Amino acid sequence: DPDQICIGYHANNSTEQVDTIMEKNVTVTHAQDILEKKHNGKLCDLDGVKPLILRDCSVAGWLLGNPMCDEFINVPEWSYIVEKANPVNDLCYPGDFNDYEELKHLLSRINHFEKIQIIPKSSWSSHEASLGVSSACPYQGKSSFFRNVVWLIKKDSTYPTIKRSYNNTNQEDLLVLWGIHHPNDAAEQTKLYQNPTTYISVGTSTLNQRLVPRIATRSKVKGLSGRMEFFWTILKPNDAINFESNGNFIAPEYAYKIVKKGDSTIMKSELEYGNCNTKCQTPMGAINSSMPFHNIHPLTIGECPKYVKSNRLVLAIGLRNSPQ
Amino acid sequence: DPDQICIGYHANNSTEQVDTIMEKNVTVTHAQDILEKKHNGKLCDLDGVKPLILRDCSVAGWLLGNPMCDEFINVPEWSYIVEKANPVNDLCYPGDFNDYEELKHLLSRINHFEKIQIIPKSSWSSHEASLGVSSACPYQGKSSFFRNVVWLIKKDSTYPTIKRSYNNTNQEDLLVLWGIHHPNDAAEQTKLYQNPTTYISVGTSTLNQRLVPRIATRSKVKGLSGRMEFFWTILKPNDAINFESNGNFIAPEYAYKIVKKGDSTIMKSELEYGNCNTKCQTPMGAINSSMPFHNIHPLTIGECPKYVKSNRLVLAIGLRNSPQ
Amino acid sequence: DPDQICIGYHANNSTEQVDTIMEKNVTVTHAQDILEKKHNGKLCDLDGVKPLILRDCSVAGWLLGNPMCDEFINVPEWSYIVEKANPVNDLCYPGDFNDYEELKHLLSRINHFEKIQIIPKSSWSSHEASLGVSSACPYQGKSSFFRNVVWLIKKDSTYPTIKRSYNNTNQEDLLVLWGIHHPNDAAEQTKLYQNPTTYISVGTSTLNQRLVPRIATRSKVKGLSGRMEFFWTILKPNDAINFESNGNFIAPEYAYKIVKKGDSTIMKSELEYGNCNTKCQTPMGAINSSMPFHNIHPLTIGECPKYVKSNRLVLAIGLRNSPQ
Amino acid sequence: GLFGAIAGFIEGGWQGMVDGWYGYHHSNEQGSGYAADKESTQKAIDGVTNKVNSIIDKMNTQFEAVGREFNNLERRIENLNKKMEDGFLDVWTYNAELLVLMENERTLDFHDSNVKNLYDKVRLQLRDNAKELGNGCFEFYHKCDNECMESVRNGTYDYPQYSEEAR
Amino acid sequence: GLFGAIAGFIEGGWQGMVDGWYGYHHSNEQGSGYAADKESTQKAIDGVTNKVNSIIDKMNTQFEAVGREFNNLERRIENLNKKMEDGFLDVWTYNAELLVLMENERTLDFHDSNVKNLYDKVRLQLRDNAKELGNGCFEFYHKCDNECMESVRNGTYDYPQYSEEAR
Amino acid sequence: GLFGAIAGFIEGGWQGMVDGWYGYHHSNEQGSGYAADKESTQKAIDGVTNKVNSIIDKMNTQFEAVGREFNNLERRIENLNKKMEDGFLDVWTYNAELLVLMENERTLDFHDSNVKNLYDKVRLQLRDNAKELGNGCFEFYHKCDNECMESVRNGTYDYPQYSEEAR
Ligand SMILES: *[C@@H]1O[C@H](CO)[C@@H](O[C@@H]2O[C@H](CO)[C@@H](O[C@@H]3O[C@H](CO[C@H]4O[C@H](CO)[C@@H](O)[C@H](O)[C@@H]4O)[C@@H](O)[C@H](O[C@@H]4O[C@H](CO)[C@@H](O)[C@H](O)[C@@H]4O)[C@@H]3O)[C@H](O)[C@H]2NC(C)=O)[C@H](O)[C@H]1NC(C)=O
Ligand SMILES: *[C@@H]1O[C@H](CO)[C@@H](O[C@@H]2O[C@H](CO)[C@@H](O[C@@H]3O[C@H](CO[C@H]4O[C@H](CO)[C@@H](O)[C@H](O)[C@@H]4O)[C@@H](O)[C@H](O[C@@H]4O[C@H](CO)[C@@H](O)[C@H](O)[C@@H]4O)[C@@H]3O)[C@H](O)[C@H]2NC(C)=O)[C@H](O)[C@H]1NC(C)=O
Ligand SMILES: *[C@@H]1O[C@H](CO)[C@@H](O[C@@H]2O[C@H](CO)[C@@H](O[C@@H]3O[C@H](CO[C@H]4O[C@H](CO)[C@@H](O)[C@H](O)[C@@H]4O)[C@@H](O)[C@H](O[C@@H]4O[C@H](CO)[C@@H](O)[C@H](O)[C@@H]4O)[C@@H]3O)[C@H](O)[C@H]2NC(C)=O)[C@H](O)[C@H]1NC(C)=O
Ligand SMILES: *[C@@H]1O[C@H](CO)[C@@H](O)[C@H](O)[C@H]1NC(C)=O
Ligand SMILES: *[C@@H]1O[C@H](CO)[C@@H](O)[C@H](O)[C@H]1NC(C)=O
Ligand SMILES: *[C@@H]1O[C@H](CO)[C@@H](O)[C@H](O)[C@H]1NC(C)=O
């Protein structure tokens, strides 16, 4: 029988299949998937700064010091904020927060954060500082209020015109929060604040604000038809903020020093901290991938692969292999 | 002559041409176009819910009951709203509509819509309910007004303070509309409303509004220097809305029950209904295609092919064919 | 030795390299780059209308006539506006400009622009028109003010109620600017304007405005705790604007005729005019290319190639060439 | 073309072969005619059809509502939408046009390949029992009747049966 | 396939060749066995690896923060974000799916090419000292021992040494 | 390469052939020299030029004004623009880089194809009147002067004129 030599190619026991532009379900000797489908099921640090996780509190409740939220623990910096879909503790006394979404966006990523006392509660000599409480905002079974602001009321049937300044002597921007109380009628107005017609004026180098209480008959929320409306500004270093008011004033006690470099966003997730680190976070877990694509979740924060609607992206590496 | 066998390929009478990356105008035996260029010239249902077609009325005129618009016919649901570019009938009495674009966006797609009477016109015992009319808003050759709101004026040189509540006993969100009249001077103010200094306060669980009439000398529009400014809110089930006013109040008579699931938009088109169904609507006609691309119009509503600036996308199917 | 004929291909002295999907650093006989990397380092006309270059003035300072800015030179049209990052001359008297960003966007590209006198300074018979000056706004070593508006004050301890109309007899839209002065306290209020409680009402066919001065204690900016707040509107042909006020009124003297067709934007650049023409401008120079891609700058105005993050896009033209 | 057969060494197509894309023409003392290669034609039809369907089926379509809902003092936001819209138009236009040009090149080269492969399959059967003319045709050194011609189309050509006559 | 070798004139693959992608099987009086072509295998591994890495490495990744920060009276702006997000999803989905289909076609054709080229390199060495069977194999007209078989794999086959025996 | 000619069985290029991309080198008793194949060179120039122009011309360019017009309390809208801008940058960067890599592969394979096709055209003319060396060259069994060499380049080589001398 004459000698022969033959040319051929590798086959093996692979059942892996790929699709080509002209042909589906081609069995090949080796294939590789370029779609990331795996996450770790946890909320992690981002490169590698921890997130601010608010548990059952909203950003507003956290900032204002809603007593129903947990005690304020110092977190000097964070990469993103995690809020639950519907935090049970938001504004314990019902009302509104002015430019709330822009504030939450400003606070999403913070390089330095420090709460300081700017106007001591004990410094209100001509007003009653410890009578502004409600059963709506309980603290240890006792009627209370947002802990970082002060609900001032009249003393001895008198509300003398307030004139306070705080000067930002610190070397950092200062987030300052205050509010106005909108009562239900004129009888309540005079009962709380004596003076029938009132205002709150606030000025900085840029801010020129004058608020007045709007009366209206309103539906009860948590048993109350009154409303607290909160405002904020950023006080530059070496600038000063000037308050003037003859009623309805929810004064600041604490403010927050801020250093902002980057910006991120608010993540809605029901997960808790996972003591991990990642470069790409989703609300159902972090992903740790060099892959170009992923299909886990669109609401990601970080440096992530491109989000696609696909169950698989498998590249052929090896050869056309006979199937089973 | 020796026998032969030859290898060859199909040719035919096709003059169809395609372009390749290296060569233009290649005649082939069979080609296929993947660009949709055809529409039916009609406004159709979308999958397969009819649009709300407003003919010569704007959304505001339709909602408020502009008498110059057509009689209100019940349409319980719709997929999108069709407005002409410039509806001739909008606000018959000149003025403004607060957050109008957001309202139109909210109403773009509606699952359930039902107009109901919430405050009967006949229930205003201490005010004149049938004297608020203008030649600007005619209804059957007689001076009239927006039919769904009521322009209240003084009775017997008196405008007693109004205090009305409507409670949403229905199981659905309620769109409520009201307005304020801005007169031209103090003489007109007292002539219409007796009281010289007036307000309109409106409250819900979330809303805390107090309007006041702004006086200004203004240009005549349709012969009138006065202005009607309208507002709206969404009243949740089991919530109540409280009005208080001593003048200038354009009170609600009818409101609209709403169930909202999806969102869409406002289509600007001059076409009328075509008694058809489609998955993709453009303002110059609907398209019924499985093709990946189209070049008909960018302002589409539905599940449409990708919009391109191209006159043709022709794929070769068959072989290189000799030309004529 | 037997004769032979051989088939072969071109080689040359090229060291140019390209990358392929399967192989990097392939030396070829001829290659071509499709990435534009070159600019001319200049600010040019756009097709071929010159930009409005504001040097050290902001749009607001330019429009209002800030005396610290350069003298107003007529430019009848422009394609885009060039502002420096931080113009030193903006509002010489501190304050705010209402809807400033939308105004700058409206003015970005202008087909016709002409400044006209609408209310002569000499026509204020019952008020003092030449006493509204400040050391903050110097003009030739003398205290002055924004040159296109007039800071009216009381004459002989009297501020009679102002009632002026300007009617747009011109055939073009008119940009009109006015302001309100927010003083520091009631003593200053009466000192400047006599009347203690004041307003400014402004009306057109569409505008229904009534401003009031807000008092607040404010930080000094350029030595002043007062604030000037400016407003604007577009007055249609054949429409008229009606002002009424008993104080705090910064009246218009000049307004601007406008014809607007296209829209563009504000370019931030430190460069000056280059006496050139282009179809695509970036802040560091113009680009003159038919190439599909470029990597110069993202903030471009014009018809530009697609912006990429790439140092080179080199296509092979010729053959695989042996390297050195 | 890439494979050198269609409009190459096989200089033109056959109007006379109506029932397939690729095939054979024979000429002997009994007559002449065209026969489609059914197998290669059907594979080609399946491949091209799959390509077209893939270009169509892999598109993700989803509901969107495109309008103009911003007012006269929201022109900056309106411009943001314009840049987005125009951007997607640019992307899809460029990718659609290039996809067509590139895939059309591939389709024509696919046909060329199929023809070349059919040619080679015949060449290897015949070997030296026939002369390769260079134009797609083989000239037999022996008589090849209709049954012999069928065996070549079938891939059943028996070389050692005709060797002696070929000499 | 495009080049006509893999699942073509070479009708199937070799389970028995475990140490490479392409190579040779020999059969003579001393025995038989498989030998990988190391050079062509390594070039192919390098090429495919570079393709995959290029598909991965050329992606520009950058930091983004994706959330939902617009309120109940900012639905128009929210819709603008939706159209943008969905648009990018559509673009990347389509391009990712087609890229995979198209490059998979190229990879398989690459293997086919490599096999065909290896075949031709052997064919040209042997010329008429061996018969081309048509199935990927050559049948020698002379005895080719293990050293002779190695010379064919090496590209060192000496044709004029066996000419006379081939006759 | 895919077609096995360039840097394949034809192991390197010719510095000496300056007037074209592909062609012939001859050697006989009258001398030796290089001759470009004008037809195949021009077709290749036309094809590659069309590809480049298509990559450039199919781009839809349109007027856009890119700035930063949102203020300090419009950061959410500013972020929306950022995601859009960065998104388009990502898309165009990836597609531009891959397009270059993929088309460069196609261009080089195109040249390889053209060379292989030129080779085959000569092979089929010569048949057994010349020996196929395996390196791109054919060694004549007969004398082929300058006129005979020209007939090979022309596609006019008369095989039956030299048959007897070839024996
Ligand atoms: C919030 O933060 C700081 C708080 O210190 C503040 O900075 C100071 O601002 C005030 C503005 O009035 C200014 O006070 C004046 O100081 C001058 C002399 O200032 C010189 O010396 C300073 C200290 O060594 C130095 O810092 C300065 O650069 C400067 O060279 C003084 O003459 C003034 O007194 C006035 O004159 C009459 C004369 O009849 C006095 O009777 C009367 O008491 C007047 O006040 C006055 O005391 C101080 O210099 C500023 N220092 C700074 C900026 O470092 C910020 O301005 C404040 N921000 C806001 C918005 O309020
Ligand atoms: C709009 O929609 C509904 C209208 O019905 C309303 O729901 C009712 O809200 C009122 C709030 O005041 C509430 O009325 C009270 O009812 C209690 C007894 O309520 C019990 O029985 C109800 C009926 O069977 C049941 O629905 C409740 O869940 C509950 O178990 C009654 O004791 C109150 O009377 C008050 O007490 C003094 C005693 O001196 C009386 O003299 C005086 O008249 C006081 O009013 C009072 O009548 C009612 O229960 C609510 N029902 C509901 C929610 O189903 C919504 O609250 C309203 N929304 C708004 C925003 O206004
Ligand atoms: C800003 O721009 C122009 C300024 O001219 C203005 O146009 C004029 O607007 C006024 C509105 O009152 C109008 O004046 C009236 O004219 C009629 C007669 O008008 C006829 O003739 C005009 C001139 O040939 C012609 O233009 C008109 O089309 C029309 O056919 C006159 O009878 C009116 O007089 C009134 O009647 C009583 C009788 O007791 C008089 O005693 C008293 O003086 C009354 O005023 C009055 O003079 C004029 O016709 C308008 N012309 C136009 C539009 O071309 C714009 O309306 C103004 N825009 C704003 C917003 O203010
Ligand atoms: C396939 O073959 C490999 C290599 O011999 C072996 O490791 C693997 O376990 C096998 N798997 C099977 C037969 O399922
Ligand atoms: C390819 O395989 C999938 C299952 O994995 C099957 O659903 C699909 O229909 C197959 N297509 C063909 C043509 O075999
Ligand atoms: C082309 O040929 C087909 C098939 O025979 C025939 O049906 C069609 O009418 C022809 N058209 C022409 C010659 O224009």
Ligand SMILES: *[C@@H]1O[C@H](CO)[C@@H](O)[C@H](O)[C@H]1NC(C)=O
């Ligand atoms: C291709 O055909 C079109 C007309 O259909 C023509 O305008 C264009 O110039 C042609 N190009 C070439 C190279 O023939």
Ligand SMILES: *[C@@H]1O[C@H](CO)[C@@H](O)[C@H](O)[C@H]1NC(C)=O
């Ligand atoms: C390369 O060769 C070309 C053509 O002869 C010549 O013009 C060029 O100067 C050369 N460059 C070198 C050797 O660097």
Ligand SMILES: *[C@@H]1O[C@H](CO)[C@@H](O)[C@H](O)[C@H]1NC(C)=O
């Ligand atoms: C290709 O060339 C560049 C330098 O121009 C070098 O950095 C890179 O590593 C090279 N890659 C290879 C595989 O040679």
